[PDB]
Design a protein around this ligand. Structure first.
Ligand SMILES: O=C1CN(C(=O)C2CCCC2)CCN1
Lengths: 237, 300
């Protein structure tokens, strides 16, 4: 059934699974019209589909043309998400198809179940984990490719860079979720932490800086301080 | 009028006939039910005084044969049987009538309740849902499961209602996943009505039969089928006007007949609130919404 803290090591076992996050599929800016009414303007979005074991990110860019002339876009966005995940699954060789797909928001369950009826053996699951994948658009290279897209496009990333050469997938996921949580809580400060030292750079083929092991320990503590700092600023503690 | 004689009543029992109930005491001089209206199906049903476990009963139509009830002390239940010797049967009934050993099916000038609960119910369709071809009548009880319940166990003792499943490939056309899930018209009109039931009369008949098995036997899978068949219509944006009007009448009489005290267990809060207040047909069931709001406003 649902995925939570009791069955967390299951994420890193050898059954292929994907997280699906739809929080950046339908994105808008709200503004005033010349008549002083309010209107939305859609901007490009993305489906965040992640294999937590390998780091493979299937970033399906959602171009604003897909909303043209459509109604009830926040509902359509869930179904378009399920449509695209189902298309991705069908495009993968059998031995690469997931055994489970975990949706980060429970409103994605029925859309995805309905689109995956052809795959009765793939489990569609919710989770009680609150994951910070909404912050994916705070990663500059992902935000850039989304905003520059002129048409529907799928781009493939490893969201863990080369970390798996040195650490386990459990530890890599822990790092990723800590970085994203910090980018979500105070983006300016998080990016300042990540980029305050010009001698540590982001390789062309990577998403995050090329930190040594000791430097990741420092970075990771600064991120926890920031999350604790903002927690204090928020609740006045 | 027709008659269902009883050989005897050796055990104390509450006997139902259609929407009526009456008590027979152990070894009371009871020999059956007379004045049964020709033209409708009927159900004769039983709840033993010493073990309310297993309500059970028989769906029959007197036009199809001469039927009687006889207690079996081995299997421990009142059994329906057919008498083929028509002169034996007529002779028996006449003696019991002459001795006034039969309770009379009530004839009421101002009530059309049973007709309105069985309008579309046919014995021939009951016998395809309840499979036992060597009898012209159909046994149902509290415990019998449905084919759908059996997929999620004895196949001979099952209720073979039409399977309805909203997250199934039958319900959802490739490429219309959102459309078909949010608006079930395709599943209702093409798959079920044109494809499986052939007409809305047969659809309503199964819906009505399911309700009555839910109410009279507490049959849980029957209640599930009745609610699924309501929800499929209410969740369809395109339903012929005559079906919506008739559905409102069907449901009105069903809610009207429901024992007030059983509504907690025979009515699904989610389905009813969805159907009356959120669904495409939320404004198309005026009679049903009015009786529900006045009779069971707690459920809503
Ligand atoms: O089956 C029967 C008939 N009875 C009636 O007609 C009573 C119940 C409602 C109508 C008055 C009770 C005796 N048994």
């Amino acid at each position: 059934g649902a995925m939570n803290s009791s069955n967390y090591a299951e994420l890193f076992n050898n059954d292929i699974k994907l997280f699906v996050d739809d929080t950046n599929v339908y994105r808008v800016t709200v503004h005033k019209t010349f008549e002083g009414n309010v209107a939305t303007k859609a901007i490009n979005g993305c489906i965040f589909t992640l294999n937590p074991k390998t780091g493979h990110l299937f970033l399906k860019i959602i171009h604003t043309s897909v909303w043209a002339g459509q109604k009830r876009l926040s509902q359509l966005a869930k179904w378009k998400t399920a449509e695209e995940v189902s298309a991705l699954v069908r495009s993968l060789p059998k031995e690469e198809q997931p055994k489970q797909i975990i949706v980060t928001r429970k409103a994605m369950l029925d859309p995805l179940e309905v689109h995956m009826l052809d795959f009765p053996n793939i489990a569609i699951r919710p989770t009680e984990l609150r994951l910070p994948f909404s912050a994916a658009m705070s990663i500059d290279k992902l935000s850039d490719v989304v905003m520059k897209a002129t048409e529907p496009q799928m781009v493939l990333f490893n969201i863990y860079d080369d970390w798996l050469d040195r650490i386990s997938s459990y530890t890599a996921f822990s790092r990723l979720t800590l970085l994203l949580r910090a980018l979500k809580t105070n983006e300016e400060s998080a990016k300042m932490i990540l980029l305050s030292d010009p001698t540590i750079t982001i390789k062309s083929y990577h998403l995050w800086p090329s930190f040594t092991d000791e430097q990741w320990i420092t970075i990771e503590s600064q991120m926890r301080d920031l999350i604790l700092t903002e927690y204090g600023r928020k609740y006045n503690v | 009028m027709n008659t269902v004689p009883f050989t005897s009543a050796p055990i104390e029992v509450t006997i139902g006939i259609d929407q009526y109930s009456f008590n027979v005491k152990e070894n009371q001089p009871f020999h059956g039910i007379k004045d049964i209206p020709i033209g409708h199906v009927h159900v004769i049903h039983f709840q033993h005084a010493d073990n309310s476990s297993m309500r059970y009963g028989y769906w029959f139509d007197c036009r199809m044969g001469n039927f009687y009830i006889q207690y079996d002390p081995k299997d421990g239940l009142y059994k329906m049987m057919e008498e083929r010797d028509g002169a034996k049967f007529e002779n028996i009934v006449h003696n019991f009538k002459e001795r006034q050993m039969m309770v009379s099916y009530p004839k009421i000038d101002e009530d059309d309740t049973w007709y309105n609960l069985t309008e579309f119910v046919q014995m021939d369709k009951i016998r395809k849902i309840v499979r036992k071809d060597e009898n012209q009548f159909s046994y149902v009880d509290s415990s019998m499961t449905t084919v759908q319940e059996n997929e999620l166990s004895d196949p001979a003792h099952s209720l073979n209602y039409t399977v309805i499943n909203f997250k199934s490939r039958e319900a959802i056309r490739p490429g219309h996943e959102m459309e078909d899930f949010l608006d079930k018209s395709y599943y209702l009109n093409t798959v079920m009505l044109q494809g499986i039931f052939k007409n809305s009369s047969n659809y309503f008949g199964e819906l009505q039969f399911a309700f009555l098995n839910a109410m009279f036997f507490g049959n849980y899978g029957s209640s599930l089928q009745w609610h699924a068949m309501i929800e499929l219509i209410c969740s369809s944006a395109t339903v012929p006007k005559h079906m919506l009007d008739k559905l409102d009448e069907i449901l009105y009489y069903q809610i009207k007949t429901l024992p007030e005290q059983y509504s907690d267990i025979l009515l699904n809060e989610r389905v009813w609130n969805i159907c009356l207040y959120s669904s495409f047909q939320k404004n198309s069931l005026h009679n049903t919404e009015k009786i529900m709001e006045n009779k069971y406003p707690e459920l809503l």
